[PDB]
Amino acid sequence: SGFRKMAFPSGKVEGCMVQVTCGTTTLNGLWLDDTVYCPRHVICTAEDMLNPNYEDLLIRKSNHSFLVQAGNVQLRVIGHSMQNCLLRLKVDTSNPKTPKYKFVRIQPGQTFSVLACYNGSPSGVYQCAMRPNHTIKGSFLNGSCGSVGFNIDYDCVSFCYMHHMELPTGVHAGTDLEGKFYGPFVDRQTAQAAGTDTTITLNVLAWLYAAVINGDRWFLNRFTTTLNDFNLVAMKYNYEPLTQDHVDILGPLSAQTGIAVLDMCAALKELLQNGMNGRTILGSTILEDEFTPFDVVRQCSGVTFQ
Amino acid sequence: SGFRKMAFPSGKVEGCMVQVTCGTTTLNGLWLDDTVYCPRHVICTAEDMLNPNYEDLLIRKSNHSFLVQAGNVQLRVIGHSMQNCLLRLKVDTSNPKTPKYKFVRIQPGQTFSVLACYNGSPSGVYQCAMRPNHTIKGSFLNGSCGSVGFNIDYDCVSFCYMHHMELPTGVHAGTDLEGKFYGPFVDRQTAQAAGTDTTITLNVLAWLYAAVINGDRWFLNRFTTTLNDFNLVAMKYNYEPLTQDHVDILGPLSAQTGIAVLDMCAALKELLQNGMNGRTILGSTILEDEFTPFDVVRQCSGVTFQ
Ligand SMILES: CC(C)(C)c1ccc(N(C(=O)c2c[nH]cn2)[C@@H](C(=O)NC2CCCC2)c2cccnc2)cc1
Ligand SMILES: CC(C)(C)c1ccc(N(C(=O)c2c[nH]cn2)[C@@H](C(=O)NC2CCCC2)c2cccnc2)cc1
């Protein structure tokens, strides 16, 4: 029993974290086989983060401009190239701890684990959702850049996020492992701000199903709704519209609990309109949107507490 | 910026997890040097968990009654002994991944990371507080027994918890790594239930200091309180009394923010009496008690956002 934000075990990623220094700037990098990936802003001067030209800054560097440290061992850089907002540094040693891995680009609403690192040293792990506005609600201090986000399936690490910067509201922005930013953000100091966010409806529904699996039904009702009628309410409460594709995704959870998706939508409509009346669901006084249907299936029992 | 429940990186512990089987019962064990630690209830029959006599059950076992598997490798048991509610199985191989480690008994209100494991395979990591009633609000399914809790300081793993059982309310009970239960619980099926819990006042105060460090002061006020006057209110709201020792612990956070401890206590008194009026603190609509003063110092910047 229980239901917590649960991260993946971080050991396979810990063995990949290194420190990269260029000039006076140090940050984290990710060492897989004979390549080290890191944010390209490692080459950026202090006095000009307002308007860097990365092509012009990088052509002025040699391989020995970069210092890469794996623990207390120096890795010699033998090549370098820019890919989007990442640098790829070729090193003279293949990481003997490289796990089976893939690079994936994750979609808004999907979750991943973050290994927060400083100076190439892992410091903590936590689970995050990619918000609809393409930010994450992380916990990062100066020098956390280059920390990565990932999911693990059958001992294969799917890397999906590298941290680049903090926005004015204290939330975080970064790229996939091809160096393409999530959202409309850029790697320079500008006035950019996160856009308005929205609540991830599919995840709220998944979490209400988790509550039923774990034995709680207090918030159900005798009503149903049409998709369109629910979406009229969702707009009023800044929830994402529900689509037929999202209804289909909830099929297995609906089958395990015997609660039709549109019947759960009617329960959610009532909770939005009337509130929770001082009660809790899975220990929470608010509706939670940072668990996906997959996360619920991963964590909950496959047998409902009827 | 940000503030999350952050676990320690789990890799040093992952390399210690093994599977232990006796008869038809399988659970997790912890392999350090040439010893495997696991719950002694691994030797307990299905048809008699109501009244096991562990001395009488264990004398009927040999070394080869126990099967220990580290990944796909079998470890031969060459000795066994009971220590309180743990079994210590001596094996023929010293774990080459044994980290620097210690066993510690943690006090109520203190936090630790849990590596949830099934069949000796790590599945997830999360951060927990030891409640005043000696339970934890974990997330554990059948077969999670033997999963461990730990903290990490300068690459030394301090193991503090091994999971034994789930109580009727869905919370979890276990032992230190000497096999002594936290709380008044026993390793058999009885009517036992968690006692009434209480809110960890020292942790709430630490988290209000975290909110000031991160830049938010909305909940402060112009009042102060005496320790005794605060404790009268704490009793009404099921908060633990504040002691002078706990005031002293808050010294460094008070110094970093310039807010005297008893002045923060006055802020907390007002929040208990008046509520939060629809506002949030560090993203939360409720007062949070699962971060210790040490956790706040570990995670927050050492420079207040003034
Ligand atoms: C060069 C530029 C791309 C503009 C950049 C500058 C600073 C940082 N940041 C670092 O900490 C860092 C830089 N180099 C090594 N570390 C911090 C940051 O984004 N500050 C913002 C305010 C000014 C510019 C952006 C930070 C703090 C906490 C978490 N994540 C990042 C990142 C990017
Ligand atoms: C023998 C006894 C000590 C009574 C015991 C029995 C079952 C378990 N439990 C297991 O899963 C297990 C046993 N052996 C290997 N796994 C589960 C459990 O506590 N059920 C309770 C209801 C009946 C008895 C107690 C469990 C579920 C989820 C999380 N944690 C534990 C533990 C202890």
Side-chain angles (χ1 to χ4, degrees), chain B residues 60-285:
Chain B
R60 300 172 190 267
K61 308 301 192 186
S62 69
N63 289 330
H64 55 280
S65 298
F66 301 91
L67 297 183
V68 179
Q69 304 174 230
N72 62 318
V73 177
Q74 233 60 4
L75 300 182
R76 184 166 81 90
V77 174
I78 60 173
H80 65 272
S81 68
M82 185 165 53
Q83 181 183 22
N84 300 307
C85 298
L86 297 188
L87 291 191
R88 289 184 298 198
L89 308 174
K90 303 300 291 185
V91 292
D92 66 351
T93 306
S94 182
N95 183 357
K97 300 180 176 185
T98 303
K100 185 170 175 291
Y101 76 91
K102 302 177 311 186
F103 292 165
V104 308
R105 185 170 176 92
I106 47 78
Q107 299 299 142
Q110 300 197 289
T111 55
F112 56 95
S113 300
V114 171
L115 181 65
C117 292
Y118 298 87
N119 305 112
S121 178
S123 70
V125 72
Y126 51 88
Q127 187 75 351
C128 282
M130 174 67 67
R131 302 306 309 175
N133 73 357
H134 311 287
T135 67
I136 62 175
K137 295 187 162 65
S139 185
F140 283 131
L141 304 183
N142 284 345
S144 54
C145 305
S147 294
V148 301
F150 59 98
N151 285 282
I152 304 189
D153 298 15
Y154 315 104
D155 291 327
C156 178
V157 179
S158 288
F159 294 103
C160 59
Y161 176 86
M162 177 163 286
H163 182 54
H164 290 241
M165 57 198 35
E166 192 171 83
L167 295 171
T169 51
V171 301
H172 304 108
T175 66
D176 61 26
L177 269 292
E178 305 214 298
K180 294 188 272 282
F181 261 92
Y182 290 106
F185 310 112
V186 297
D187 52 352
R188 58 193 65 205
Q189 175 56 12
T190 77
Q192 58 196 330
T196 59
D197 205 20
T198 189
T199 295
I200 308 156
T201 302
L202 174 58
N203 292 1
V204 179
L205 293 166
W207 171 85
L208 293 175
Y209 278 109
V212 176
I213 294 173
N214 284 16
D216 201 357
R217 295 176 59 102
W218 71 258
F219 50 86
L220 301 178
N221 67 33
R222 69 172 173 100
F223 303 111
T224 198
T225 184
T226 67
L227 201 54
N228 204 73
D229 283 350
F230 174 87
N231 283 342
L232 293 173
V233 174
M235 282 196 69
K236 177 175 176 179
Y237 290 94
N238 194 24
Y239 268 56
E240 294 183 319
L242 195 64
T243 63
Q244 184 61 45
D245 290 354
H246 295 176
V247 172
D248 292 343
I249 286 170
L250 291 166
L253 288 168
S254 175
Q256 190 180 322
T257 60
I259 296 161
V261 173
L262 286 176
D263 290 348
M264 192 66 85
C265 285
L268 171 57
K269 183 191 298 178
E270 180 173 307
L271 287 169
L272 291 174
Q273 293 168 337
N274 299 345
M276 290 159 73
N277 295 111
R279 304 185 67 160
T280 56
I281 296 172
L282 290 169
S284 178
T285 64

Side-chain angles (χ1 to χ4, degrees), chain A residues 149-170:
Chain A
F150 59 98
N151 285 282
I152 304 189
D153 298 15
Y154 315 104
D155 291 327
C156 178
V157 179
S158 288
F159 294 103
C160 59
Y161 176 86
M162 177 163 286
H163 182 54
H164 290 241
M165 57 198 35
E166 192 171 83
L167 295 171
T169 51

Side-chain angles (χ1 to χ4, degrees), chain A residues 18-29 36 38 42-43 61-69 74 77 87 89 119:
Chain A
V18 300
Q19 187 184 256
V20 183
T21 302
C22 184
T24 56
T25 303
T26 302
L27 45 59
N28 306 284
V36 171
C38 71
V42 71
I43 69 180
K61 308 301 192 186
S62 69
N63 289 330
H64 55 280
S65 298
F66 301 91
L67 297 183
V68 179
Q69 304 174 230
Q74 233 60 4
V77 174
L87 291 191
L89 308 174
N119 305 112

Side-chain angles (χ1 to χ4, degrees), chain A residues 216-227:
Chain A
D216 201 357
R217 295 176 59 102
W218 71 258
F219 50 86
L220 301 178
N221 67 33
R222 69 172 173 100
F223 303 111
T224 198
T225 184
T226 67
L227 201 54

